[PDB]
Amino acid sequence: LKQIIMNNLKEYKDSTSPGKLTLSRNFTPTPVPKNKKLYQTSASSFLDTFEGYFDQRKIVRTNAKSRHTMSMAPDVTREEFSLVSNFFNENFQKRPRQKLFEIQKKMFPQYWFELTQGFSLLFYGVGSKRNFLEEFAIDYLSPKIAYSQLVNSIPCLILNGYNPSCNYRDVFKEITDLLVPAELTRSETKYWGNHVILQIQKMIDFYKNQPLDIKLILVVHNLDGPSIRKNTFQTMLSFLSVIRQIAIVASTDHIYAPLLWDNMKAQNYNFVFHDISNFEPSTVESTFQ
Amino acid sequence: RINTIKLWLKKDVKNVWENLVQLDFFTEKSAVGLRDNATAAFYASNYQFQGTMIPFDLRSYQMQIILQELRRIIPKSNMYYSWTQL
Amino acid sequence: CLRKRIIEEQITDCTDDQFQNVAANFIHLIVQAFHSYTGNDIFALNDLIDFKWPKYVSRITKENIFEPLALYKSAIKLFLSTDDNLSQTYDLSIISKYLLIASYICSYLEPRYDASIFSRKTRIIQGRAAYGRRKKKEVNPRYLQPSLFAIERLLAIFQAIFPIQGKAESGSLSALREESLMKANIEVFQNLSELHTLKLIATTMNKNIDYLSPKVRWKVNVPWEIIKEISESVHFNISDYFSDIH
Amino acid sequence: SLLVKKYCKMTTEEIIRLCNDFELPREVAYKIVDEYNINASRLVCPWQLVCGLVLNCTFIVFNERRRKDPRIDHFIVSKMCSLMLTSKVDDVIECVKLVKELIIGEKWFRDLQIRYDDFDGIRYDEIIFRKLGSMLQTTNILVTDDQYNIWKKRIEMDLA
Amino acid sequence: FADAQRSHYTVYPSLPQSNKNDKHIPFVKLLSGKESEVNVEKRWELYHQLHSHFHDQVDHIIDNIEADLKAEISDLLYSETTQKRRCFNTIFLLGSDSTTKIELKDESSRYNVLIELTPKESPNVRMMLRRSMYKLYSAADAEEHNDVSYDLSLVENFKRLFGKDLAMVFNFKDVDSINFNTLDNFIILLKSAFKYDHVKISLIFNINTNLSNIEKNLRQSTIRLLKRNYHKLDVSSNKGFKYGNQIFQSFLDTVDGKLNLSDRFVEFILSKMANNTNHNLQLLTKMLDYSLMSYFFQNAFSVFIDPVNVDFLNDDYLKILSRCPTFMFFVEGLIKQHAPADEILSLLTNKNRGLEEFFVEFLVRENPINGHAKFVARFLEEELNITNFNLIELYHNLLIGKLDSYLDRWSACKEYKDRLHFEPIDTIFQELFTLDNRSGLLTQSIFPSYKSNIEDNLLSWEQVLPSLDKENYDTLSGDLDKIMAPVLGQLFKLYREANMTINIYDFYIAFRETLPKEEILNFIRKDPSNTKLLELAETPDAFDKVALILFMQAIFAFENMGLIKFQSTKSYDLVEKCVWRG
């Protein structure tokens, strides 16, 4: 209606008289508040902008230094601290959390459909992100894919990255135990060349023309955990996810996590940035720090 | 103060700066030249230097001879003699 | 090349004596020009001769051999400028070009002497700005080893200096929700991560490097010329920020 | 204009009048007055804050009629551009967005938001699926069935 | 052990008996069940067929450009005749994403083995020297059937060991991320084997930034000889649009005459095309696949592009397609054009036969815009003979109507720009067969504003909070959620409004003054579960201590999110901020 509708707007623009537009039909006008008393006449300028940063970042006086400490307040054993924290986490927002969790369910078909084409999956946002994937994977993916492939359910392992002892050689050992790939000759391990990387480079070519199906899924939690965020492990997973037979569902929590990866890694690792925020307490994660 | 004089650009000084440093007139601030034994020479090639990684022209250097030494050493009849005293 | 030019010119007036004489005087010119450059070395002179001989031979002629001073005047250009390396300088994206521009500023400018020139908002609530640099500096920190900084500084300054995009129309709703200013997307993160492997942004040199840490300081490894070449090519101007202090 | 003027003064009934020219309720006017008398100490021009407050009250309470008639947007903006005697309006746009930034996190503002269900002009139950990453999100390029049912009558009588 | 205490451990999944359901595919019955499972099967099969069909050209083109670059590199790497015989051929891949593999021609009377070095295996000189020697020996030994140490003597002793001369090719994989003094030492060492008159070698730098960027980072001693004989290549996945245009045109042809694109989508893709030059086609194909996935997930009319299913044109589909606004425009235009109303009653829903007849009549159309783009590309390639030109840009200009203004950039087709100007006007039923990101999902799942979207929720916490009012009593927090904001939002607000440095005790009390006392105590009363908590709450300062509890756990959580760099070790009594909103 491009040519006519503009004429309609132009003609109808000049018609209505500004005076007689009654915004509300049945309103009673605002009177004068009686008392003057109730109207008692009791930091920086910018809060969220680079000028806000500038304003908040300036100099302060030393004698204006309130040298106060938490010992100027009760300090009691951590047992009841955790008790009350868990009480609040189990009784303060339980009903809304359950309802929003149920609302966040109908996207499982979308998740599975995307996984079908071989796209590695993302999960960022606020709150614990463990009580979502552990029930997503087991209760949706393996049975549905097992039935669609036509047999046994597709097996899976879990990778707790937040572990300060999370290494990669044991992970590759488990990969060898489960998938059972072929070993390497002596003419390719070039002068102490790392075994796992070359083995995976052989495996990707071995699977380059195998039936386009699924055989296993590996899950990760807190990908940016202390001993898991290291370049070796990250490179291993980034070269890993070219497999069609397997794909990864990933959880993330850090604000600057997105700078940890390289453009090549993103090209080979192909997350799809789904946002899922829940405002959860992460009680069980409060065990390492 | 006044056959003419020509100054040489940064590109021209680039080539000759290494000729200076390779003739044992300058050094690096926290330098250590030649390790005595095998283990030290081995660790030398394993761990690299800030001077190695930072660019050419901003690594801290050091001097061998001092102004007054050069002043009493050089032939004082040079046109640059008037410019050998701080 | 001798025989090449002797028949490219097609002049039947020559002899080995005169060939040797012309080569001898050309070498006399070479040494008289570049002795100050090197002095008493042979290897570099031979390399330079191999590089620049053909251009001189391409200019010699009958009149130039009869009177070699004009021949030297016609080939004086290589003597005056070696220029022995190799319009454009890059085939990169725009944010890669424009963000490296910011970093040079964020390590050669004082953190406090920038709020005067790097602000464009109109004040609303009460507050005073600073007086800037009351005292001129006489060292021109171009000559100095650069400083350290956190990345949020780069974010802020890049947001400030970013070219204009998100064209508006001043309509009833055009600018009501456009928010015409680049924000912290993912592409800048990725192209910045690329730069470290490009070794143009330098961090504290570390085996077992960790891009993610509260305590990491950052820096750059580029001279003034690297940054200058970008400015006029992209039609950006920052020389005025540095040309006034010293 | 009304914003270039510096260090102006105001009273209860002046801004009550300015808010009552729209016929808005009294609770909103009282809330604006409380905001003013609490945070009118570090000001430069109270016209900006009061104008922003009343405009963002109108947009939140009048979402229904604005939705059913996209003409209102221009009429309201013209009325509040003529009442403050200005021809330029980007300053009014700032007077809206800055107050939105400032007043973004107060519980009474929360109560107003849940009451009049604007949440940026779109419903909660739709925006959650709009932003969560689904394709079932109901972008209403199509039209509702009752619209067609009531439109049929217009051409039912086309013979005349 | 508890479940998640360990790391990299495994758990086996169990299975139910079976479901005997052919509906074991993600696609779902749209229209509140007014779809048919047979139609779902049709959509599934058609999507897979078309996806594989397009992937056929995906593989063809990815192999084609790879073969093109292999042929070019081999052409420019061999037969480059030197005359001094004391210099090696150096090649420069200006900006190549350095992970492709190159071939090696035999050229009998010469044995050839490639050399590849990575930063990991290049800490010092001798190590990578041994790598190269081991490679050369183990490659040239088995090919013809005693041991010699790994050194530069072996290469010059190759003749009197194997009988054949050798030519080497070197490929520094990641040229930029290696130690430059080690590189200089290595090159100086290798220039010491040009005194045997029986060997040739060649070096290739797979550069990523530029030549002038690093040619002065390394000492000019090495650079002098490197100016002798070089080669330069412009390297990228999107070279001259020679294949991006092909991908766009093949995608147009595979689904030609069924779908079109708006100006917004085309401009969005044009903008994101130049944000990463090295990888440009992979991402556009990725997001196009995502777009088709979403389209075939959400469009119930996917089954009406194959003519076979025209027989299943149902009444519900007729109803929903009748609501098309451009169809409404057509109806009203005809109403105004003709006072009599016989054809509209003949064709309109009042008799659905005419409606479906019209549906097929305007479905068989060609959507001439796509064909116009196709033969406009044909015109360009046949008369202007241009390959350095996007087709997506021309699509955008045609959609805008500025196609004449954009071809004016070239100005060689001016004598025919008028006839080639496709008057861009909307088509009927444009809303169900087209694609554009008015939904606001592509930027939400491909290029999100990460911390912007994070902080939006952190600050609002109503875009996700269930806004419910009736079921309060059953929930323990029924009387509390309505009146209290959650910890995180209030902490974020105070944290942002605070200054650069923030104390702990005064800041905690400032936060604490935003809490209710009797109401939170009532919330605690509601739960008789924790007797320890009952005894804790029986005292007044219990409110202060629970506020401290939540404060502590919340700030602990914030710490690992990157918001704070906990300052003043040995004191732990004040902090600093690093993350800003917006």
PDB file of N, CA, C and O in Angstrom, chain C residues 158-208:
ATOM      1  N   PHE C 158      37.710   3.223  22.218  1.00  0.00           N
ATOM      2  CA  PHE C 158      37.262   2.792  20.900  1.00  0.00           C
ATOM      3  C   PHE C 158      35.807   3.175  20.673  1.00  0.00           C
ATOM      4  O   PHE C 158      35.440   3.632  19.585  1.00  0.00           O
ATOM      5  N   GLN C 159      34.960   2.999  21.690  1.00  0.00           N
ATOM      6  CA  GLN C 159      33.580   3.447  21.568  1.00  0.00           C
ATOM      7  C   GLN C 159      33.530   4.934  21.262  1.00  0.00           C
ATOM      8  O   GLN C 159      32.736   5.382  20.427  1.00  0.00           O
ATOM      9  N   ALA C 160      34.380   5.714  21.927  1.00  0.00           N
ATOM     10  CA  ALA C 160      34.393   7.152  21.689  1.00  0.00           C
ATOM     11  C   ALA C 160      34.822   7.482  20.262  1.00  0.00           C
ATOM     12  O   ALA C 160      34.190   8.311  19.598  1.00  0.00           O
ATOM     13  N   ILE C 161      35.888   6.842  19.769  1.00  0.00           N
ATOM     14  CA  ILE C 161      36.474   7.246  18.491  1.00  0.00           C
ATOM     15  C   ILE C 161      35.883   6.525  17.291  1.00  0.00           C
ATOM     16  O   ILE C 161      36.263   6.830  16.154  1.00  0.00           O
ATOM     17  N   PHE C 162      34.976   5.580  17.503  1.00  0.00           N
ATOM     18  CA  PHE C 162      34.491   4.771  16.397  1.00  0.00           C
ATOM     19  C   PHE C 162      33.789   5.656  15.368  1.00  0.00           C
ATOM     20  O   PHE C 162      33.057   6.578  15.743  1.00  0.00           O
ATOM     21  N   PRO C 163      33.986   5.411  14.070  1.00  0.00           N
ATOM     22  CA  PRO C 163      33.265   6.198  13.064  1.00  0.00           C
ATOM     23  C   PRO C 163      31.759   6.069  13.239  1.00  0.00           C
ATOM     24  O   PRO C 163      31.270   5.245  14.014  1.00  0.00           O
ATOM     25  N   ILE C 164      31.021   6.905  12.509  1.00  0.00           N
ATOM     26  CA  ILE C 164      29.570   6.943  12.649  1.00  0.00           C
ATOM     27  C   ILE C 164      28.946   5.848  11.796  1.00  0.00           C
ATOM     28  O   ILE C 164      29.344   5.631  10.644  1.00  0.00           O
ATOM     29  N   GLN C 165      27.964   5.152  12.361  1.00  0.00           N
ATOM     30  CA  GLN C 165      27.190   4.152  11.638  1.00  0.00           C
ATOM     31  C   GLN C 165      25.749   4.244  12.124  1.00  0.00           C
ATOM     32  O   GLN C 165      25.374   5.183  12.834  1.00  0.00           O
ATOM     33  N   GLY C 166      24.935   3.261  11.747  1.00  0.00           N
ATOM     34  CA  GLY C 166      23.534   3.271  12.117  1.00  0.00           C
ATOM     35  C   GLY C 166      22.855   4.566  11.725  1.00  0.00           C
ATOM     36  O   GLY C 166      22.396   5.322  12.587  1.00  0.00           O
ATOM     37  N   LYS C 167      22.793   4.836  10.424  1.00  0.00           N
ATOM     38  CA  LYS C 167      22.224   6.085   9.938  1.00  0.00           C
ATOM     39  C   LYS C 167      20.779   6.228  10.398  1.00  0.00           C
ATOM     40  O   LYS C 167      19.986   5.287  10.298  1.00  0.00           O
ATOM     41  N   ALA C 168      20.440   7.412  10.902  1.00  0.00           N
ATOM     42  CA  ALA C 168      19.099   7.716  11.371  1.00  0.00           C
ATOM     43  C   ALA C 168      18.374   8.586  10.347  1.00  0.00           C
ATOM     44  O   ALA C 168      18.911   8.936   9.293  1.00  0.00           O
ATOM     45  N   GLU C 169      17.130   8.941  10.669  1.00  0.00           N
ATOM     46  CA  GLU C 169      16.301   9.751   9.788  1.00  0.00           C
ATOM     47  C   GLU C 169      15.597  10.898  10.500  1.00  0.00           C
ATOM     48  O   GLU C 169      14.911  11.681   9.834  1.00  0.00           O
ATOM     49  N   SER C 170      15.751  11.034  11.818  1.00  0.00           N
ATOM     50  CA  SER C 170      15.051  12.059  12.589  1.00  0.00           C
ATOM     51  C   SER C 170      13.538  11.890  12.494  1.00  0.00           C
ATOM     52  O   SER C 170      12.787  12.868  12.549  1.00  0.00           O
ATOM     53  N   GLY C 171      13.080  10.646  12.345  1.00  0.00           N
ATOM     54  CA  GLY C 171      11.666  10.354  12.270  1.00  0.00           C
ATOM     55  C   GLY C 171      11.032  10.202  13.642  1.00  0.00           C
ATOM     56  O   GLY C 171      11.684  10.285  14.682  1.00  0.00           O
ATOM     57  N   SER C 172       9.717   9.969  13.629  1.00  0.00           N
ATOM     58  CA  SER C 172       8.978   9.840  14.880  1.00  0.00           C
ATOM     59  C   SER C 172       9.434   8.629  15.681  1.00  0.00           C
ATOM     60  O   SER C 172       9.260   8.595  16.904  1.00  0.00           O
ATOM     61  N   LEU C 173      10.008   7.629  15.016  1.00  0.00           N
ATOM     62  CA  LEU C 173      10.494   6.439  15.699  1.00  0.00           C
ATOM     63  C   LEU C 173      11.878   6.014  15.232  1.00  0.00           C
ATOM     64  O   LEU C 173      12.430   5.062  15.792  1.00  0.00           O
ATOM     65  N   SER C 174      12.461   6.691  14.241  1.00  0.00           N
ATOM     66  CA  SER C 174      13.744   6.262  13.697  1.00  0.00           C
ATOM     67  C   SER C 174      14.801   6.170  14.791  1.00  0.00           C
ATOM     68  O   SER C 174      15.359   5.097  15.047  1.00  0.00           O
ATOM     69  N   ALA C 175      15.084   7.288  15.452  1.00  0.00           N
ATOM     70  CA  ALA C 175      16.101   7.346  16.492  1.00  0.00           C
ATOM     71  C   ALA C 175      15.557   6.987  17.869  1.00  0.00           C
ATOM     72  O   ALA C 175      16.305   7.041  18.849  1.00  0.00           O
ATOM     73  N   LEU C 176      14.277   6.624  17.965  1.00  0.00           N
ATOM     74  CA  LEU C 176      13.701   6.309  19.266  1.00  0.00           C
ATOM     75  C   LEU C 176      14.238   4.999  19.824  1.00  0.00           C
ATOM     76  O   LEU C 176      14.243   4.805  21.045  1.00  0.00           O
ATOM     77  N   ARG C 177      14.678   4.086  18.957  1.00  0.00           N
ATOM     78  CA  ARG C 177      15.189   2.795  19.393  1.00  0.00           C
ATOM     79  C   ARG C 177      16.440   2.357  18.645  1.00  0.00           C
ATOM     80  O   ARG C 177      16.954   1.269  18.923  1.00  0.00           O
ATOM     81  N   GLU C 178      16.946   3.166  17.712  1.00  0.00           N
ATOM     82  CA  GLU C 178      18.077   2.732  16.898  1.00  0.00           C
ATOM     83  C   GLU C 178      19.315   2.479  17.749  1.00  0.00           C
ATOM     84  O   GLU C 178      20.016   1.480  17.548  1.00  0.00           O
ATOM     85  N   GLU C 179      19.601   3.361  18.702  1.00  0.00           N
ATOM     86  CA  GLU C 179      20.819   3.270  19.501  1.00  0.00           C
ATOM     87  C   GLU C 179      22.045   3.229  18.588  1.00  0.00           C
ATOM     88  O   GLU C 179      22.767   2.235  18.507  1.00  0.00           O
ATOM     89  N   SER C 180      22.257   4.341  17.885  1.00  0.00           N
ATOM     90  CA  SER C 180      23.278   4.416  16.847  1.00  0.00           C
ATOM     91  C   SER C 180      24.680   4.530  17.433  1.00  0.00           C
ATOM     92  O   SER C 180      25.278   5.610  17.424  1.00  0.00           O
ATOM     93  N   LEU C 181      25.210   3.419  17.939  1.00  0.00           N
ATOM     94  CA  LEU C 181      26.578   3.375  18.439  1.00  0.00           C
ATOM     95  C   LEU C 181      26.952   1.918  18.656  1.00  0.00           C
ATOM     96  O   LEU C 181      26.183   1.164  19.259  1.00  0.00           O
ATOM     97  N   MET C 182      28.127   1.527  18.168  1.00  0.00           N
ATOM     98  CA  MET C 182      28.541   0.137  18.270  1.00  0.00           C
ATOM     99  C   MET C 182      28.654  -0.277  19.731  1.00  0.00           C
ATOM    100  O   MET C 182      29.062   0.507  20.593  1.00  0.00           O
ATOM    101  N   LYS C 183      28.283  -1.523  20.007  1.00  0.00           N
ATOM    102  CA  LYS C 183      28.322  -2.077  21.350  1.00  0.00           C
ATOM    103  C   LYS C 183      29.282  -3.261  21.371  1.00  0.00           C
ATOM    104  O   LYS C 183      29.914  -3.597  20.365  1.00  0.00           O
ATOM    105  N   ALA C 184      29.395  -3.894  22.538  1.00  0.00           N
ATOM    106  CA  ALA C 184      30.315  -5.010  22.717  1.00  0.00           C
ATOM    107  C   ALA C 184      29.752  -6.291  22.115  1.00  0.00           C
ATOM    108  O   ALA C 184      29.152  -7.105  22.822  1.00  0.00           O
ATOM    109  N   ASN C 185      29.945  -6.477  20.812  1.00  0.00           N
ATOM    110  CA  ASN C 185      29.489  -7.683  20.134  1.00  0.00           C
ATOM    111  C   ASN C 185      30.554  -8.767  20.270  1.00  0.00           C
ATOM    112  O   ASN C 185      31.502  -8.651  21.050  1.00  0.00           O
ATOM    113  N   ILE C 186      30.407  -9.842  19.502  1.00  0.00           N
ATOM    114  CA  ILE C 186      31.359 -10.941  19.561  1.00  0.00           C
ATOM    115  C   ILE C 186      32.474 -10.780  18.529  1.00  0.00           C
ATOM    116  O   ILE C 186      33.602 -11.236  18.756  1.00  0.00           O
ATOM    117  N   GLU C 187      32.183 -10.132  17.399  1.00  0.00           N
ATOM    118  CA  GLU C 187      33.168 -10.028  16.329  1.00  0.00           C
ATOM    119  C   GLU C 187      34.400  -9.251  16.767  1.00  0.00           C
ATOM    120  O   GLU C 187      35.522  -9.606  16.389  1.00  0.00           O
ATOM    121  N   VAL C 188      34.220  -8.183  17.545  1.00  0.00           N
ATOM    122  CA  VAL C 188      35.375  -7.454  18.052  1.00  0.00           C
ATOM    123  C   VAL C 188      36.209  -8.351  18.957  1.00  0.00           C
ATOM    124  O   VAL C 188      37.442  -8.358  18.875  1.00  0.00           O
ATOM    125  N   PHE C 189      35.556  -9.122  19.830  1.00  0.00           N
ATOM    126  CA  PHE C 189      36.295 -10.067  20.660  1.00  0.00           C
ATOM    127  C   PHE C 189      37.136 -11.001  19.807  1.00  0.00           C
ATOM    128  O   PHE C 189      38.324 -11.211  20.084  1.00  0.00           O
ATOM    129  N   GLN C 190      36.540 -11.577  18.766  1.00  0.00           N
ATOM    130  CA  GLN C 190      37.263 -12.544  17.950  1.00  0.00           C
ATOM    131  C   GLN C 190      38.401 -11.905  17.163  1.00  0.00           C
ATOM    132  O   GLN C 190      39.506 -12.457  17.114  1.00  0.00           O
ATOM    133  N   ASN C 191      38.167 -10.744  16.553  1.00  0.00           N
ATOM    134  CA  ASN C 191      39.238 -10.082  15.822  1.00  0.00           C
ATOM    135  C   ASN C 191      40.337  -9.559  16.735  1.00  0.00           C
ATOM    136  O   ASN C 191      41.477  -9.422  16.282  1.00  0.00           O
ATOM    137  N   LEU C 192      40.034  -9.278  18.001  1.00  0.00           N
ATOM    138  CA  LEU C 192      41.067  -8.939  18.970  1.00  0.00           C
ATOM    139  C   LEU C 192      41.883 -10.166  19.353  1.00  0.00           C
ATOM    140  O   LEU C 192      43.115 -10.108  19.404  1.00  0.00           O
ATOM    141  N   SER C 193      41.207 -11.285  19.621  1.00  0.00           N
ATOM    142  CA  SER C 193      41.921 -12.529  19.878  1.00  0.00           C
ATOM    143  C   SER C 193      42.832 -12.882  18.716  1.00  0.00           C
ATOM    144  O   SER C 193      43.924 -13.423  18.919  1.00  0.00           O
ATOM    145  N   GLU C 194      42.401 -12.579  17.489  1.00  0.00           N
ATOM    146  CA  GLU C 194      43.258 -12.804  16.330  1.00  0.00           C
ATOM    147  C   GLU C 194      44.542 -11.991  16.417  1.00  0.00           C
ATOM    148  O   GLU C 194      45.618 -12.488  16.064  1.00  0.00           O
ATOM    149  N   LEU C 195      44.454 -10.745  16.882  1.00  0.00           N
ATOM    150  CA  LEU C 195      45.613  -9.863  16.914  1.00  0.00           C
ATOM    151  C   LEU C 195      46.747 -10.420  17.765  1.00  0.00           C
ATOM    152  O   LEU C 195      47.919 -10.263  17.406  1.00  0.00           O
ATOM    153  N   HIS C 196      46.433 -11.069  18.887  1.00  0.00           N
ATOM    154  CA  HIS C 196      47.499 -11.604  19.725  1.00  0.00           C
ATOM    155  C   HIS C 196      48.298 -12.670  18.991  1.00  0.00           C
ATOM    156  O   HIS C 196      49.528 -12.718  19.100  1.00  0.00           O
ATOM    157  N   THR C 197      47.617 -13.558  18.263  1.00  0.00           N
ATOM    158  CA  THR C 197      48.339 -14.515  17.435  1.00  0.00           C
ATOM    159  C   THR C 197      49.040 -13.817  16.281  1.00  0.00           C
ATOM    160  O   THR C 197      50.062 -14.307  15.789  1.00  0.00           O
ATOM    161  N   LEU C 198      48.507 -12.679  15.838  1.00  0.00           N
ATOM    162  CA  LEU C 198      49.231 -11.834  14.899  1.00  0.00           C
ATOM    163  C   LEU C 198      50.381 -11.093  15.566  1.00  0.00           C
ATOM    164  O   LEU C 198      51.164 -10.440  14.868  1.00  0.00           O
ATOM    165  N   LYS C 199      50.494 -11.177  16.891  1.00  0.00           N
ATOM    166  CA  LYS C 199      51.629 -10.632  17.634  1.00  0.00           C
ATOM    167  C   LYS C 199      51.797  -9.138  17.393  1.00  0.00           C
ATOM    168  O   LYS C 199      52.911  -8.611  17.450  1.00  0.00           O
ATOM    169  N   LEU C 200      50.695  -8.445  17.113  1.00  0.00           N
ATOM    170  CA  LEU C 200      50.705  -6.992  17.051  1.00  0.00           C
ATOM    171  C   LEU C 200      50.311  -6.353  18.371  1.00  0.00           C
ATOM    172  O   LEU C 200      50.913  -5.344  18.757  1.00  0.00           O
ATOM    173  N   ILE C 201      49.335  -6.911  19.069  1.00  0.00           N
ATOM    174  CA  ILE C 201      49.106  -6.591  20.471  1.00  0.00           C
ATOM    175  C   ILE C 201      49.943  -7.546  21.304  1.00  0.00           C
ATOM    176  O   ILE C 201      49.842  -8.771  21.177  1.00  0.00           O
ATOM    177  N   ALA C 202      50.785  -6.983  22.161  1.00  0.00           N
ATOM    178  CA  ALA C 202      51.688  -7.765  22.987  1.00  0.00           C
ATOM    179  C   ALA C 202      51.215  -7.742  24.432  1.00  0.00           C
ATOM    180  O   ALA C 202      50.909  -6.687  24.994  1.00  0.00           O
ATOM    181  N   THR C 203      51.147  -8.931  25.023  1.00  0.00           N
ATOM    182  CA  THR C 203      50.829  -9.068  26.437  1.00  0.00           C
ATOM    183  C   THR C 203      52.103  -9.456  27.173  1.00  0.00           C
ATOM    184  O   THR C 203      53.123  -9.731  26.534  1.00  0.00           O
ATOM    185  N   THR C 204      52.067  -9.468  28.504  1.00  0.00           N
ATOM    186  CA  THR C 204      53.204  -9.960  29.268  1.00  0.00           C
ATOM    187  C   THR C 204      53.619 -11.309  28.703  1.00  0.00           C
ATOM    188  O   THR C 204      52.845 -12.270  28.754  1.00  0.00           O
ATOM    189  N   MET C 205      54.822 -11.388  28.137  1.00  0.00           N
ATOM    190  CA  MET C 205      55.265 -12.625  27.511  1.00  0.00           C
ATOM    191  C   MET C 205      55.187 -13.765  28.515  1.00  0.00           C
ATOM    192  O   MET C 205      55.749 -13.680  29.611  1.00  0.00           O
ATOM    193  N   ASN C 206      54.477 -14.826  28.146  1.00  0.00           N
ATOM    194  CA  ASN C 206      54.245 -15.931  29.064  1.00  0.00           C
ATOM    195  C   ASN C 206      54.055 -17.222  28.288  1.00  0.00           C
ATOM    196  O   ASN C 206      53.238 -17.281  27.366  1.00  0.00           O
ATOM    197  N   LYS C 207      54.814 -18.244  28.666  1.00  0.00           N
ATOM    198  CA  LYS C 207      54.463 -19.616  28.346  1.00  0.00           C
ATOM    199  C   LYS C 207      53.342 -20.039  29.284  1.00  0.00           C
ATOM    200  O   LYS C 207      53.328 -19.657  30.457  1.00  0.00           O
ATOM    201  N   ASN C 208      52.391 -20.810  28.757  1.00  0.00           N
ATOM    202  CA  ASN C 208      51.124 -21.057  29.444  1.00  0.00           C
ATOM    203  C   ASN C 208      50.332 -19.755  29.558  1.00  0.00           C
ATOM    204  O   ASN C 208      49.789 -19.413  30.610  1.00  0.00           O
TER     205      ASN C 208
END
